[PDB]
Each structure stands twice: as structure tokens, then as C-alpha cells.
Amino acid sequence: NAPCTTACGCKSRLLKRLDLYTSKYADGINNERENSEAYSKLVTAALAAVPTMQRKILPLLGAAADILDICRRELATARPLVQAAISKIEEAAGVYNTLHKLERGLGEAKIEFGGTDLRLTKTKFRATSLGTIHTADCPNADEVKIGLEHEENEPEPAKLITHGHLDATCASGVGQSSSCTAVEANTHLTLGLTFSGSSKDESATWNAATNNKRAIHSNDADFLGSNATVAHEALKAIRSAGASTPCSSLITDFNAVRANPKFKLMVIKALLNKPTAEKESDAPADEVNNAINSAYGREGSEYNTKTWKDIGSTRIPKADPPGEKTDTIDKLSSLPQWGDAIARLLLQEIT
Amino acid sequence: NAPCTTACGCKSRLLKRLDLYTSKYADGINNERENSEAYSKLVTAALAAVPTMQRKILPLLGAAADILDICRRELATARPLVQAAISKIEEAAGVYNTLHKLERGLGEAKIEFTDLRLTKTKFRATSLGTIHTADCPNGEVKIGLEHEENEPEPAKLITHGHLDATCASGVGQSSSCHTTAVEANTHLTLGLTFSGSSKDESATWNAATNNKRAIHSNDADFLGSNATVAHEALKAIRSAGASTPCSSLITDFNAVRANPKFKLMVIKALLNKPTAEKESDAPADEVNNAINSAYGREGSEYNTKTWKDIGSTRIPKADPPGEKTDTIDKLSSLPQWGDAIARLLLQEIT
Numbered sequence: 001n002a003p004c005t006t007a008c009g010c011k012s013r014l015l016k017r018l019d020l021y022t023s024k025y026a027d028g029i030n031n032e033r034e035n036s037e038a039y040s041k042l043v044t045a046a047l048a049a050v051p052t053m054q055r056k057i058l059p060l061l062g063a064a065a066d067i068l069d070i071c072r073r074e075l076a077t078a079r080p081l082v083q084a085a086i087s088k089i090e091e092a093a094g095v096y097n098t099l100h101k102l103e104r105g106l107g108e109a110k111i112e113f114g115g116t117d118l119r120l121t122k123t124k125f126r127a128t129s130l131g132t133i134h135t136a137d138c139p140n141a142d143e144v145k146i147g148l149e150h151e152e153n154e155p156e157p158a159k160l161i162t163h164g165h166l167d168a169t170c171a172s173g174v175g176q177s178s179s180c181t182a183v184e185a186n187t188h189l190t191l192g193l194t195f196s197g198s199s200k201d202e203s204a205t206w207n208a209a210t211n212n213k214r215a216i217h218s219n220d221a222d223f224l225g226s227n228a229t230v231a232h233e234a235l236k237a238i239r240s241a242g243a244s245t246p247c248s249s250l251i252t253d254f255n256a257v258r259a260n261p262k263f264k265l266m267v268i269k270a271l272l273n274k275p276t277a278e279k280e281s282d283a284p285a286d287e288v289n290n291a292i293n294s295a296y297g298r299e300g301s302e303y304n305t306k307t308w309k310d311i312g313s314t315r316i317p318k319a320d321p322p323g324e325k326t327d328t329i330d331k332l333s334s335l336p337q338w339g340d341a342i343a344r345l346l347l348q349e350i351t
Numbered sequence: 352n353a354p355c356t357t358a359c360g361c362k363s364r365l366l367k368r369l370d371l372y373t374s375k376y377a378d379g380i381n382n383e384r385e386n387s388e389a390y391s392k393l394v395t396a397a398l399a400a401v402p403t404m405q406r407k408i409l410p411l412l413g414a415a416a417d418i419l420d421i422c423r424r425e426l427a428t429a430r431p432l433v434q435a436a437i438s439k440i441e442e443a444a445g446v447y448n449t450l451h452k453l454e455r456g457l458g459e460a461k462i463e464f465t466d467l468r469l470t471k472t473k474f475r476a477t478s479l480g481t482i483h484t485a486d487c488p489n490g491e492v493k494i495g496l497e498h499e500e501n502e503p504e505p506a507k508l509i510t511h512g513h514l515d516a517t518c519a520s521g522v523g524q525s526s527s528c529h530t531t532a533v534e535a536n537t538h539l540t541l542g543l544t545f546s547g548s549s550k551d552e553s554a555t556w557n558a559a560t561n562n563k564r565a566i567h568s569n570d571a572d573f574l575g576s577n578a579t580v581a582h583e584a585l586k587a588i589r590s591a592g593a594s595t596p597c598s599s600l601i602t603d604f605n606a607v608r609a610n611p612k613f614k615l616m617v618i619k620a621l622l623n624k625p626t627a628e629k630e631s632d633a634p635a636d637e638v639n640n641a642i643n644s645a646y647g648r649e650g651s652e653y654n655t656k657t658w659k660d661i662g663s664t665r666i667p668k669a670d671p672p673g674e675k676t677d678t679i680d681k682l683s684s685l686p687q688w689g690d691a692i693a694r695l696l697l698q699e700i701t
């Protein structure tokens with residue numbers, strides 16, 4: 001619930017939040033692949049199977065088309081929102097890389113006048129770390145519970161650096177124990193650059209005690225700007241559209257089919273010998289339930305262990321140069337072969 | 352193309368290059384949606400149509416299944432490569448944002464000392480730490496997939512930080528501090544800039560400190576390999592042959608005619624040779640004549656006629672007062688087509 005506090009932590013948390021959405025989107029992509037295959041499997045089997053089996057497949061077809069169409073539309077709605085979030089989060093993550101390079105500051109210039117005179121050459125600059133960035137990897141342990149249920153109250157990613165600070169230390173006199181006593185030959189003068197999330201001006205104390213390192217002026221250094229806010233808003237856009245979990249329903253889940261009015265109606269038409277029925281009330285609910293239990297096991301308990309196994313074992317035509325052959329849907333397990341089978345089965349009926 | 356030379360230009364060029372690939376990928380996604388619809392129309396119409404139309408549909412169906420399968424497999428191969436490229440390019444772009452803020456350096460501290468005592472008021476300049484805030488101007492170049500193999504790696508821009516020093520002593524700040532010790536008229540300026548090369552100008556500076564020079568450099572490799580890794584992710588798409596996935600459309604007769612499934616089904620369905628399994632079962636001229644009769648000469652009526660006739664196919668429609676019928680194009684959704692298929696098969700059983 002608490003905001004992130006380091007560049008490594010802010011970047012890790014933001015990419016972990018992104019992963020909540022992209023992982024569900026990928027689940028949806030996989031589900032659409034499985035649903036497209038299942039629907040093709042149903043159409044092909046419905047054409048090829050014997051009537052006792054065809055009657056068990058017909059109630060699945062309209063419901064399966066509904067599932068697949070909704071699945072695909074959910075993905076198409078989610079796609080541009082997920083893409084916008086990926087691009088905005090990854091841009092902010094690049095900025096966090098630089099914030100991590102700057103976390104320890106940018107070094108210092110330290111003049112030690114040497115004790116003989118106040119002339120100056122490079123050799124009196126003993127510290128010249130100024131301009132050195134931080135090169136270490138992030139620590140292995142940083143950063144919090146991350147999940148879609150927590151996203152409504154997750155705070156914005158932190159900006160971390162808003163100001164640059166001119167740090168100064170002066171020391172005049174022998175031993176460098178007094179305060180800048182005018183700058184003289186034993187004087188150490190150190191100027192450095194650091195960064196933080198707040199403006200600083202500590203000259204009030206520094207001016208009476210110049211031998212303590214203090215931030216004596218601050219300048220604006222807003223690196224992230226609104227990049228992290230816009231990334232946060234892009235994640236909210238996915239949630240506001242209801243697009244966080246697209247294509248979660250599967251044709252191979254009996255509970256996704258069993259609720260569809262078209263399934264209950266086609267049970268009546270195809271399994272209760274009432275083909276002209278158009279309303280679920282056209283057969284007694286008991287007879288509908290007994291037909292469902294006979295066709296798919298009790299309350300659909302055999303929908304996967306038997307019904308889909310029987311669908312996959314349906315024999316269909318197969319091309320072969322010696323003459324057309326046959327094999328099962330599950331052996332000829334590809335759309336090109338199922339399509340070829342459909343054409344060959346329809347040609348057979350024409351012939 | 353010469354390498355990019357500014358943070359704004361490097362960022363813009365990398366995003367423009369990425370768009371070459373994401374745009375083609377999006378075309379593929381759109382083509383897969385259109386191909387899925389076309390294949391479902393063909394199956395539905397093949398089950399419902401009159402026999403003369405069914406025979407024209409059957410050669411399209413098998414080809415369409417293979418076009419759609421290839422389309423989807425090409426998109427599946429391309430998908431992780433495009434995803435990786437987008438992630439890597441956008442992370443690099445974020446770094447370039449910061450390179451733009453650093454491109455004019457990070458200011459300076461200018462001390463201006465009657466005596467050599469020191470307080471902040473003698474700091475005529477306290478700009479150290481100020482980043483550049485302006486937007487990019489309105490080094491940047493031809494961009495296109497045919498140019499990608501020759502495109503240089505993105506420039507790193509900043510590899511080193513520089514300590515810039517100036518020391519000017521004496522009245523009027525006219526002399527060098529190597530021969531005139533820091534005195535009361537002296538201006539001492541220490542600043543930080545960045546560039547793409549290491550610098551050590553101290554030999555000249557040590558004999559004339561009143562000239563601003565970079566007297567020391569340190570490592571400031573902000574990008575690391577981030578931008579080269581993004582460049583290599585774009586190449587990975589090209590190396591996989593994945594830059595234009597699902598470019599074929601079932602509605603393009605040239606794509607259908609070129610699919611290996613098409614000619615045999617013409618022989619089987621349109622030349623009255625249903626047991627044929629080889630293209631050598633019919634003379635090429637007869638196949639061509641059957642294609643011309645079914646789809647117009649060289650397929651020239653495939654969209655103006657064949658697909659209109661497919662769309663006009665009448666199919667069952669659910670209705671509470673009893674099943675009705677309407678055309679595929681009026682019932683223009685996969686849900687209604689699937690329901691129609693079930694109803695058509697039931698009618699055959701009945």
C-alpha cells in the first residue's frame with residue numbers, strides 16, 4: 001500500500017503490476033487459440049459423426065460460437081489498452097534506469113590547495129569523481145502485495161528525484177578545522193552534486209560551520225515528469241474498460257456451455273425428438289435434464305472424459321495419393337486437415 | 352543513414368523504426384480477423400448452398416483452411432518477437448528522455464571571491480544540478496523495412512561526464528591561476544558536462560587556467576546496452592522472416608489460386624472426378640476452364656460475383672414463433688452462423 005522508495009523498487013513494482021495485465025491477456029490469447037480449435041473440432045465432427053453422436057454435438061455448436069465470438073471481441077477491446085500500458089510502463093522503466101544511475105549522486109570536485117600557495121593546477125584536484133554515475137546492479141532484496149484486487153488503491157509510482165543539490169564543504173587554516181578564516185594555502189574546498197525529492201537550502205547552518213558538508217543551493221531536476229503518472233493511468237484504463245481478463249471462458253468447460261439458452265434449446269430439438277421447438281419451455285425441464293445427463297454424463301460430468309474424447313475419435317476423410325483414406329480428428333489434428341475433411345464430406349454427400 | 356546525434360532524434364528514429372514492424376503486425380492481426388470471418392462464411396455457405404454453388408465453394412474451403420492456419424501460425428511466431436521489440440525500444444526511449452534532459456550539461460558552481468572569505472553570495476553561479484526542461488525542437492533520414500539491414504546501431508550520446516574548470520585571477524580576471532595564486536579578484540568555476548568521448552584537457556589548462564577546459568572525465572554510461580538490445584530485437588523479427596505475418600487474404604483470389612490445396616479440389620468438385628487425389632488427374636486446360644467458369648476468367652469475378660453469391664446464401668434463423676431463414680450477409684455474425692450450422696445438420700438428420 002506504501003509507495004515505492006528507490007528506483008530499483010519502483011521499476012520492479014511497476015513491471016510486476018504490468019505483468020498482472022499482460023499475463024491475463026496472454027491467458028486470453030491461449031484460450032482463443034484453444035477455443036478456435038475446439039469450434040473447428042465441433043463443426044468437423046458434427047458433419048462426420050453418426051447420428052447418435054451428431055445429436056450430442058449439435059447442442060454445443062451455437063453455444064461454442066457464442067463463446068468464441070465473445071472471446072475474440074474481448075481480446076480485440078483489450079488489445080489497444082494493453083499495448084498502451086506496455087509502452088507507457090516500459091518508457092517509465094527506462095527513466096527509472098537513469099534514476100538508479102543517479103541514486104548515489106554525481107560525485108565531487110575537491111581542491112586541496114596543498115599548504116604552500118594558492119596557485120592552482122589539476123594536481124590540486126584530489127577528488128574529481130564529478131560526473132561518475134552508479135554502476136552496480138540492483139540489490140537482490142529490495143518492496144508489498146501485488147494483484148488485480150489491490151490495484152484500485154495502489155499509489156502512483158514515486159518520482160524519487162525532483163531537485164539537484166550543490167553540496168559544499170570549505171575548510172581554511174592549518175589542519176582544516178576552522179570555517180571559511182579566508183581561504184588560504186591549507187584550505188580544502190569540495191563541491192559536489194546530489195539529488196533528492198525535496199528542495200534544500202542549508203546555508204544558514206553552513207555559513208557558521210563551513211567544514212560540514214551541506215546542500216547550499218537546489219535546482220530543479222524533474223526527470224520523470226508525468227511519465228509514471230501516465231503509466232499508472234494506462235493500467236487504470238484497462239480496469240475501467242473491464243478488459244483485465246479477456247477471453248476467460250472455454251468451450252471445453254461444460255459450465256460455459258450449459259448456461260447458454262441455445263444449448264438447452266438444441267437439447268430439446270436434437271435429443272428429445274422435438275426439432276421444431278424454439279423455446280426452452282417446449283419440453284419439461286426434467287426431460288431436458290435427463291437428456292443432458294444421458295448425453296454428457298450426470299450434470300455434464302463426462303463432458304471432457306467422454307464427450308470430447310468421442311469427438312476427437314470421430315473418423316474423417318484424409319487425402320492420400322493412392323486414394324482417400326480415413327483417420328480420427330485427433331490424429332489429423334490441424335485446421336488444414338479438418339477443412340479438407342469438411343470439403344470431402346460435403347462432396348461425398350453431393351456425389 | 353548516418354547515426355543519430357541527439358537524444359530527441361535517436362528516440363524519434365527508434366520509435367519510427369519500431370512502427371514499421373508494429374504496423375505490419377497490426378495488418379496481420381486485421382487480416383486474421385478477416386480471414387477467420389471468411390472461412391466461417393465458407394463453411395456455413397458450403398453446408399447451406401444449392402449444389403451448383405456448393406461445388407464452387409468447396410475448392411475455396413480447403414484452400415481457406417490452409418491460408419487461415421498459416422496466417423495464425425505466422426502471427427504466433429511473430430507475436431513474442433514484436434512484444435520483445437516493443438518492450439526494449441520503449442525502455443531505451445525512456446533513457447533517451449533523460450539523455451535529453453542532460454544534453455546541455457548540469458550547470459556549474461562559480462565562486463567570485465576585497466578578500467578570500469567565502470559565503471554563498473560570492474557564488475555568482477549556482478546552476479549545478481539544473482536539467483534541461485524544454486521540449487524537443489520541431490541529425491534526423493530514410494526509414495523503411497528495405498533500409499533496416501543498413502541502419503547503424505543507435506548512438507549512446509553520453510558515455511562520460513566531464514569536470515569543467517575555470518580559474519581566472521587578478522583584477523579583471525585576466526591571468527591564469529598556475530602563476531597567479533587565487534586572490535580576491537579571482538573567479539573559480541567548476542561545472543559538469545557530458546559527451547560521447549573521454550576528455551582530459553589538463554595539460555593545456557595547467558598553463559592557462561582562465562580558459563574553461565574539461566580537466567577530468569568519468570564514466571557516465573547511461574544507456575549501457577539498452578539501445579543496442581532494442582536494435583537487435585528489431586533484427587530478430589527480420590531474422591525470423593516474421594516482419595509481415597498473415598499477409599495473405601482468403602478474399603484475394605491470387606492467394607487462393609496459389610494455395611496448394613486449391614487445384615485438386617477444383618478437379619474433385621468442378622471436373623466431376625471426386626476420387627481424384629493428384630493434379631495430374633486432369634489436364635491443366637480443363638482445370639483452367641473450370642476455374643474461369645466458376646470464378647470468372649482468371650478469378651476476375653471472385654469478389655464481384657462469387658463472394659456476393661456466397662453472402663446471399665439463405666440459412667436458418669432462430670425465432671420464437673418458429674425457425675425463419677435469412678442470408679449469411681444479413682445474419683453476418685459467427686454466433687448466428689454456428690447456430691445455423693446446427694440447425695442445418697439437424698434438418699438433414701430429420
Ligand SMILES: *[C@@H]1O[C@H](CO)[C@@H](O)[C@H](O)[C@H]1NC(C)=O
Pocket residue numbers: 088091223224225226227230448449
Ligand atoms: C515522458 O516524458 C517525456 C519528457 O521527458 C515526454 O516526451 C513523453 O511524452 C512522456 N511520455 C509519455 C508516455 O507521456
Ligand SMILES: *[C@@H]1O[C@H](CO)[C@@H](O)[C@H](O)[C@H]1NC(C)=O
Pocket residue numbers: 097098439442573574575576577580
Ligand atoms: C537496460 O539497462 C539496465 C541498466 O540500467 C538493465 O537493468 C536492463 O536489463 C536493461 N534492459 C534490457 C532490456 O536489457
